[PDB]
């Protein structure tokens, strides 16, 4: 939590961050609860599918992080011990 | 495209049409079918996730890093590009 987080949110271009525990519940978030739930659940779906895709292509391989770029932002989703970290940046 | 292939660390590339059919590949056909079909599923999930968050937004790039490689999917007009890099 604290050590990685503040550092990430203090990075140029970072506009939002969310930490989700291994049950999928948000633990820390810069966004309002309703938005938080949307990003967390949607990004968790995308991550779980990236994870399966990686293993389907190669059973000995393992996904480490996903980045989805769009017109308006880029979102990174990174497995982290007992947590998933979602970072939205410009 | 040729310039994509000749970038350091790039190990494979595939070009897929809007219908899901590979139009060019540096890989063999069986591998090409697996990457194309699985990356396409992932890209399609990424596209709808983007739209669900903001219906005015569109996905432009997807990068999946793993222990052994990184895989990039870029939507490009009437094609998708899939690049596997070390």
Automatic annotation (TrEMBL), chain B:
Assigned keywords, A-Z: Cytoplasm, Cytoskeleton, Dynein, Microtubule, Motor protein, Transport
SMART domains recorded: Robl_LC7 (SM00960)
Matching SUPFAM superfamilies: Roadblock/LC7 domain
Pfam families assigned to the protein according to its UniProt record, in alphabetical order: Robl_LC7
GO-annotated cellular components: axonemal dynein complex; centrosome; cytoplasm; cytoplasmic dynein complex; microtubule
Domain of life: Eukaryota
Compartments in which it is found: Cytoplasm, Cytoskeleton
Keyword 4Fe-4S appears in the UniProt entry: no
GO BP annotations, alphabetical order: dendrite morphogenesis; microtubule-based movement; mushroom body development
InterPro entries, per database record: DYNLRB1/2 (IPR016561), Roadblock/LAMTOR2_dom (IPR004942)
Keyword Transcription: no
Domain Roadblock/LAMTOR2: 1-85
GO molecular-function terms, A-Z: dynein intermediate chain binding
Family designation: Belongs to the GAMAD family.
Function: Acts as one of several non-catalytic accessory components of the cytoplasmic dynein 1 complex that are thought to be involved in linking dynein to cargos and to adapter proteins that regulate dynein function. Cytoplasmic dynein 1 acts as a motor for the intracellular retrograde motility of vesicles and organelles along microtubules.
Name of the protein in question: Dynein light chain roadblock
Species classification: Eukaryota, Metazoa, Ecdysozoa, Arthropoda, Hexapoda
């Amino acid at each position: 939590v604290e050590e990685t987080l503040k550092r990430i949110q203090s990075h140029k271009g970072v506009v939002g961050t969310i930490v989700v525990n291994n049950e999928g519940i948000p633990v820390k978030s810069t966004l309002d609860n309703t938005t938080t739930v949307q990003y967390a659940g949607l990004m968790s779906q995308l991550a779980d599918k990236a994870r399966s895709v990686v293993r389907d292509l190669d059973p000995s391989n393992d996904m480490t992080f996903l980045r989805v770029r769009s017109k308006k932002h880029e979102i990174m989703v990174a497995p982290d011990k007992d947590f998933i970290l979602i970072v939205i940046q410009n």
